[PDB]
Design a protein around this ligand. Structure first.
Ligand SMILES: O=C1NC=C(F)[C@H](O)N1
Ligand SMILES: O=C1NC=C(F)[C@H](O)N1
Ligand SMILES: [Fe+3]
Ligand SMILES: [Fe+3]
Lengths: 423, 423
């Protein structure tokens, strides 16, 4: 078994490092003063970057791989997406869900993702997808720690037996309680649905992840209730507000007032760049707003924010290979986090910040932690992002679970020349 | 003791008037048909304007004279101001508060102000400033009738034990119940905080003065709850909505609907020109809104509105000499009340309208009232405002408590010439 990772670069650190492994855990981390020789039982990072695993804080594995079935989302909006999904949800089968979820999970394993939070639509009396996903969770455990959010896609108060079905999903084992206040029939149902969500999370000791204000409506302010209830219950670390795209349209004075509460509450935020740039701004003609939440300001204020892929070939997104560096690339551009340091520090948005969002207790390159880490063939975060590098090796429990032999490009000039796009 | 004020001009009246004094009160007011001779026991207004005392309806004496301690409000916003104040509040001492409050009160006495309403932050378990201010109130009584507002600066529902501390402040003697709905964590807490404020005011028979919608948020409409609760309880005269700067940003249709309720409710409004022009519009780039409430429209609709200084060298305002004519000057410009009559009638915004806001029962130049009046060396309100004249004499209980010997300016041309800036 592997005993050491050598010649590793670490974000924010100078030089090279050696990571000693023992019994599936990291036993010690020591700085090197030069390049170490390879040897049996040593995985050579070759001066590449070593980081804890990529994380997918927000994806829909029950809907993945279904775009165009039975119809396509023509308008490219959240609302038509839900209608198209409703048509597909009526055709679900146990095996159908497991096969599609596993297809995307394999792409995630290949992409160095070892932690995934999937929402599963529980606005369905049969709970077909949830039952299938609970089995997938057990099956994929050796490679990915999968969290399941009981997501009441059609509302808690606005769907028949919505609250009972949400609770049934928790009794069956869902890890996180979801909600979607802006989709409820009225603002009052939206606020009430959040009180019910928090009560269920406290009753069952579960996390919370709300699809919150995913709409270009400057009056959609459910995020303040999510943060206030979390603060009141002293449970911010266990709470996440996904999307908050309406915040892109708020006036600045209200946003400033709100930010004090967001920071005090300690709740987490997920932005989904690939899907948000596609679904938001659809009701504008020109100019057209970007529609991503206030990521730059959250980072400046010390509010935990991270990025999710959200959808992979489904009603809300026709593309994707479940690649977090690609999600990061889109977010940095749309949010204008284009300074050198902002880009270089971008990896935090798909690693550490996402681990905090999932309330992970065993994450990071530190002594005592499980030996879960990935190696990128790049010098730092900036380089990895610019070149959209693959994951050279993914290690879990001290064993290699995925590897990518890099592509080899040659140009035939006066003589052949290898091209690696580096400077 | 003084027996008469002679050669006095009165706002809205033609000619000169004599005000007879007896036992510290005004015994009679009689018109003169010409200039009266001076004599012992007669204070000669010298054809200057005689008015009841200036009033300061909104100031923070617990924070006065603390700008830059320990840090400056860099952004010039309400929100950073509260954060900077929090840092200073942690350093308060009894003597510190009394000394600074008295420094500003002396400037007010010098400026002919005999009625002052100070807010005091009670989001503090030690209630340090409140205890100090209650002593200052007794000490300054011979010169100024000071009202104290128990102001829960960090919220009633959003601060630990906020409601209990607010009530404790009333049990200790605060004259007015305050609130700050737009600073509460949620809109629901904002509305609920107002029900609690009104319940306390009725339980203790106290006045109400809410820091209401002091934010450039077109959705901040707490003023309608303040007015509706006042109307329901039949207590409009005892209620004040301070700031209402959000009203500057409301659409006109909602404002028109709202105005019917504002008039029916009978509540009072305070605008704070010097601070509002500084703190509002801070989230705009260009164009930049003024941010003062709808003073002109309130006056046209017969809704009582008046002006306060708000802050004198503190986290929210780096300037000031506690001068009401200066506050008035700024308000007339920013609110575009620049017609001759509007400027001339401007004195009402810092005298009679403010007295109504404080629910004063002994105010005005009328027989039977206490002999509390000031003399301005000017022909009318327009002249006093244009030349920013000092208070020549301030009389309280029939005795002179302040006087200003005017500056003397001379230009040396072919011959020396006195300049008084008059036409
Ligand atoms: O409500 C939603 N359902 C599915 C999505 F992909 C999007 O995150 N929002
Ligand atoms: O909430 C507030 N505190 C202090 C001020 F000066 C301003 O009136 N508003
Ligand atoms: Fe989603
Ligand atoms: Fe104030």
């Amino acid at each position: 078994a592997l005993q050491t990772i050598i010649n590793a670069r670490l974000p924010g650190e100078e030089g090279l490092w050696q990571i000693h492994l023992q019994d599936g855990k990291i036993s010690a981390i020591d700085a090197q003063s030069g390049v170490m020789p390879i040897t049996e039982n040593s995985l050579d990072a070759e001066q590449g970057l070593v980081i804890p695993p990529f994380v997918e804080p927000h994806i829909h594995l029950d809907t993945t791989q279904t775009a165009g079935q039975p119809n396509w989302n023509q308008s490219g909006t959240l609302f038509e997406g839900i209608e198209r999904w409703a048509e597909r949800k009526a055709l679900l089968t146990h095996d159908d869900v497991k096969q599609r979820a596993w297809q995307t999970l394999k792409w995630q394993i290949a992409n160095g993702i070892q932690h995934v939070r999937t929402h599963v639509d529980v606005s369905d009396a049969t709970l077909t997808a949830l039952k299938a996903m609970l089995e997938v969770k057990q099956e994929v455990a050796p490679w990915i720690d999968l969290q399941i959010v009981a997501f009441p896609q059609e509302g808690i108060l606005s769907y028949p037996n919505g609250e009972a079905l949400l609770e049934e999903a928790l009794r069956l084992g869902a890890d996180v309680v979801g909600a979607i206040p802006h989709f409820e029939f009225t603002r009052e149902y939206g606020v009430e649905s959040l009180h019910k969500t928090f009560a269920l999370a406290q009753k069952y000791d579960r996390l919370i992840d709300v699809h919150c204000d995913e709409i270009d409506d400057e009056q959609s302010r459910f995020v303040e209730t999510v943060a206030a209830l979390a603060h009141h219950e002293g449970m911010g670390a266990r709470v996440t507000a996904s999307h908050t795209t309406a915040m892109h349209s708020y006036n600045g004075a209200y946003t400033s007032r709100l930010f004090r509460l967001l920071k005090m509450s300690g709740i987490n935020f997920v932005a989904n760049p690939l899907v948000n740039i596609h679904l938001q701004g659809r009701f504008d003609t020109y100019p057209k707003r970007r529609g991503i939440t206030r990521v730059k300001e959250m980072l400046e204020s010390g509010i935990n924010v991270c990025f999710g892929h959200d959808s992979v070939f489904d009603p809300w997104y026709p593309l994707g290979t479940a690649n977090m560096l690609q999600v990061l690339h889109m977010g940095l551009h749309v949010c204008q986090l284009m300074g050198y340091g902002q880009i270089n520090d971008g990896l935090n948005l798909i690693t550490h910040h996402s681990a905090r969002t999932l309330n992970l207790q065993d994450y990071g390159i530190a002594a005592g932690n499980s030996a879960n880490l990935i190696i990128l063939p790049a010098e730092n975060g900036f380089d990895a992002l610019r070149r959209q590098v693959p994951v050279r090796y993914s290690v879990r429990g001290g064993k290699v679970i995925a590897s990518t032999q890099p592509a080899q490009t040659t140009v035939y000039l006066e003589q052949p020349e290898a091209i690696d796009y580096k400077r």
